[PDB]
Design a protein around this ligand. Structure first.
Ligand code: 4GD
Length: 289
């Protein structure tokens, strides 16, 4: 698959000279962090997401890696790359607009959006698992599975994003450059290992955020790291029911416990004891069915 090349100046124009103000005030800034800033734009009669990246060589390597993974990987649960820009000063990546932003922002009800129902959350969990399965089937390791990297479209379909740090398989490799988000990382990933088993662990943290509506890490909280609730539940100090997001009216105990069981399995500290993505996908499908 080949992408439409965009002029840097057309992208600069449609994003109101890369306006870093929120949409609420009259700016184009939608979000940031993914080794760049994502702005709202309007190209070839469509609303778009323009990612302005953002060592300069390491950032360009992430730019090429995203294009390479996007050229090979086309799936309904992955973000769709429309084109890129390299001609100007900054490196730009153009995507199909995801009106519902990120799963992280929707779980926190950022900007006054209504809480996601249990029914929508079940669909998002299944969709995100289908996207990870597609990546693993095609021998790709994401390396940064988190709620901020799960986008939501006009129908709340889960779309995995940010393939800049993605790695090929088609074992277990080691690296000197340890990348990812701490609160979501498997123990071995924090040590330098590169394995698809690390994506499973991070997805387990995502499932906990979906059940609880709580961020993976919170400074003003006990436990500070969401993954530690697994121990509280296993040591009968608490139950998953004590953790269920109260911003839902349609959550039943059975399906919540079925999703928690998947999360708990994903969160096994020993990489080889975790289920593979196909098993995760099967278990999440059985939950609804
Ligand atoms: C309303 C809205 C729309 C979007 N984001 C997008 O539409 C989007 C599409 N592909 N993509 C690839 C990477 C990052 N963002 C995107 N966001 C958003 C959410 C979190 C971080 C960055 C942008 N917010």
């Amino acid at each position: 698959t080949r992408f439409h090349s965009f002029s840097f100046y057309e992208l600069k124009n449609v994003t109101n000279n890369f306006d870093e103000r929120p949409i609420s005030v009259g700016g184009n800034k939608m979000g940031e962090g993914g080794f760049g800033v994502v702005y709202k734009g309007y190209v070839n009669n469509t609303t778009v997401a323009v990612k302005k990246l953002a060592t300069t060589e390491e950032l360009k390597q992430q730019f090429d890696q995203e294009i390479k993974v996007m050229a090979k990987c086309q799936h309904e649960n992955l973000v769709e790359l429309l084109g890129f820009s390299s001609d100007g000063d900054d490196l730009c990546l153009v995507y199909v607009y995801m009106p519902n932003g990120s799963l992280l922002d929707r779980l926190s009800c950022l900007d006054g959006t209504p809480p996601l129902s249990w029914h929508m959350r079940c669909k998002i969990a299944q969709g995100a698992a289908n996207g990870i399965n597609f990546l693993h089937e095609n021998h790709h390791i994401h390396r940064d599975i988190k709620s901020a990297n799960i986008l939501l479209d006009e129908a709340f379909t889960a779309k995995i994003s940010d393939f800049g740090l993605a790695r090929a398989s088609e074992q277990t490799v080691m690296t000197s450059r340890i990348v990812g988000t701490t609160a979501y990382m498997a123990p071995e990933a924090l040590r330098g290992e590169i394995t698809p088993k690390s994506d499973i662990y991070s997805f387990g943290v995502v499932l906990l955020e979906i059940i609880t509506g709580l961020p993976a890490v919170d400074e003003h909280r006990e436990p500070q790291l969401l993954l530690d609730i697994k121990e509280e539940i296993e040591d009968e100090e608490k139950t998953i029911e004590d953790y269920i997001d109260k911003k839902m009216n349609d959550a039943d105990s059975t399906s919540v416990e079925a999703m928690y069981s998947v999360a708990s399995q994903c969160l096994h500290e020993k990489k080889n004891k975790r289920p593979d993505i196909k098993k995760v996908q099967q278990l999440l499908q059985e939950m609804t069915a």
